[PDB]
Homo-oligomer: 52 residues x 4
């Protein structure tokens, strides 16, 4: 494409990579922490039920 069109594509591409990376990191963190809370709750409920 033209110089200006390619520059625009370059800017959008590079920032999309940055945005996607940070997004994936936050998604993974939210998933990890939520998953752990569910694991903890599951284990704790089992322990409580086994105690009364």
């Amino acid at each position: 494409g033209s110089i200006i069109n390619e520059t625009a594509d370059d800017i959008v591409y590079r920032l999309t990579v940055i945005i996607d990376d940070r997004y994936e990191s936050l998604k993974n963190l939210i998933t990890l922490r939520a998953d752990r809370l569910e694991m903890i709750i599951n284990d704790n409920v089992s322990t409580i039920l086994a105690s009364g």
Copy 2:
């Protein structure tokens, strides 16, 4: 010509779509995990109460 102004608008437009899409995805994920945890907590508490 006006191509520089138009290209700037296109860059902003394209990245806005990306930014918004990732935002919605995180918003939905956070909401989903929050809802899941609330239901899990409420269900488990009922089970515990039904046992004493």
Copy 3:
């Protein structure tokens, strides 16, 4: 062209900030709600034995 770069950065910063504040509010409100739900349910359990 330099003012164009500033315009792009400014406009996108405004949108980035808007979505950022929305997520911050969501996270805070949902976490607050979960803490309340957890404590309320625990109180019920403690009051039941």
Copy 4:
């Protein structure tokens, strides 16, 4: 090395700084709230188990 390339690099760099800053803030907030939830769940479960 050109004016157009330096401009693209400039735009990408400046927005990356912004994106990174907001990312770190959200990361820290999620971590903080998740840590609090684990502590509150841990505290309450220990209390329940110690009460019956």
